[PDB]
From Swiss-Prot:
Enzyme Commission number, as recorded: 4.2.1.1, 4.2.1.69
Impact reported for residue 4 to H: Reduced proton transfer rate
Its biological purpose: Catalyzes the reversible hydration of carbon dioxide. Can also hydrate cyanamide to urea. Stimulates the chloride-bicarbonate exchange activity of SLC26A6. Essential for bone resorption and osteoclast differentiation. Involved in the regulation of fluid secretion into the anterior chamber of the eye. Contributes to intracellular pH regulation in the duodenal upper villous epithelium during proton-coupled peptide absorption.
Binding site for substrate: 195-196
Feature type site, description Fine-tunes the proton-transfer properties of H-64: 4, 59, 64
Illness the protein is tied to: Osteopetrosis, autosomal recessive 3: A rare genetic disease characterized by abnormally dense bone, due to defective resorption of immature bone. Osteopetrosis occurs in two forms: a severe autosomal recessive form occurring in utero, infancy, or childhood, and a benign autosomal dominant form occurring in adolescence or adulthood. Recessive osteopetrosis commonly manifests in early infancy with macrocephaly, feeding difficulties, evolving blindness and deafness, bone marrow failure, severe anemia, and hepatosplenomegaly.
Active site: 61 (proton donor/acceptor)
Miscellaneous comment text of the record: Target of drugs used in treatments against glaucoma disorder and breast cancer.
Positions that bind Zn(2+): 91, 93, 116
Protein name: Carbonic anhydrase 2
Result when mutating residue 4 to F: Enhanced activity
SMART domains named in the record: Carb_anhydrase (SM01057)
Name of the gene encoding the protein in the UniProt record: CA2
Organism, scientific name: Homo sapiens
Length: 257
């Protein structure tokens, strides 16, 4: 019964998921004055030419755009990573107001939203195996600010009416996730966790330096989604973000000078 409400939000998750107070929790604040350039980091390689989106699902916590992950169709490699990571889904976290919504922060700045492209390490065979490994997942995080529209987001926005409530899904084929990337692939990286229960410490985080812009109308449509199921009292799906967690015995590395 975890969520982001008045009585089940992030500050409560530790009771059912005690690693919520663990050593490698996410998100974190990225202090640009202490993250150090690491010349041993490599560019990242984002290979989404062959990506097969399938479906979009309102899971009661966000919406997931799901991919074929039964071959090396959409992969993330390079950067800080060893080996190959398959795209399984992407989703967002966003606010009720434009001054909040991101999970990671940059010098304490909150963005309006944050996109997570979730990938699993093919050495482990399936996502469920991967999440049990410290190097099982690679999550590419991209900040959203409100300004111009993002054309590549509009087909996501326009399907949201069909998945308003928890448990609804819709066919969502032929979506190109390249349309959600910023110009630059400069990034910060650190070891952390899933930001939702079960909060497993299985993630190499790769957070892009450059935000994307979305319009105020696009974010407004995110904010019309519902946490609740059909026929239940309406609870707008807003503020579905976990706040920054203690960095502890970690360093954030920068790919850029
Ligand atoms: Zn996420």
């Amino acid at each position: 019964h975890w969520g982001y409400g008045k009585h089940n939000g992030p500050e409560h998750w530790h009771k059912d998921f005690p690693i919520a107070k663990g050593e490698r929790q996410s998100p974190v604040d990225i202090d640009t004055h202490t993250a150090k350039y690491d010349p041993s980091l490599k560019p990242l390689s984002v290979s989404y030419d062959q990506a097969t989106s399938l479906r979009i699902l309102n899971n009661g916590h966000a919406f997931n755009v799901e991919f074929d992950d039964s071959q090396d169709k959409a992969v993330l490699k390079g950067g800080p990573l060893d080996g190959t990571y398959r795209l399984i889904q992407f989703h967002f976290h966003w606010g009720s107001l434009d001054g909040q919504g991101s999970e990671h922060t940059v010098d304490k700045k909150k963005y309006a939203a944050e996109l997570h492209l979730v990938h699993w390490n093919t050495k482990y065979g399936d996502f469920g195996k991967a999440v049990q490994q410290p190097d099982g997942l690679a999550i590419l995080g991209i900040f959203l600010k409100v300004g111009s529209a993002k054309p590549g987001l509009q087909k996501v926005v326009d399907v949201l009416d069909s998945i308003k409530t928890k448990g609804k899904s819709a066919d969502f084929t032929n979506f190109d996730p390249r349309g959600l990337l910023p110009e630059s692939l400069d990034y910060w990286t650190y070891p952390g966790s899933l930001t939702t229960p079960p909060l497993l410490e299985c993630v190499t985080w790769i957070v892009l330096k450059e935000p994307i812009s979305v319009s105020s109308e696009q974010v407004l449509k995110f904010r019309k989604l519902n946490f609740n199921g059909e026929g239940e009292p309406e609870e707008l799906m807003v503020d579905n973000w976990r706040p920054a967690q203690p960095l502890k015995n970690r360093q954030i590395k920068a790919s850029f000078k």
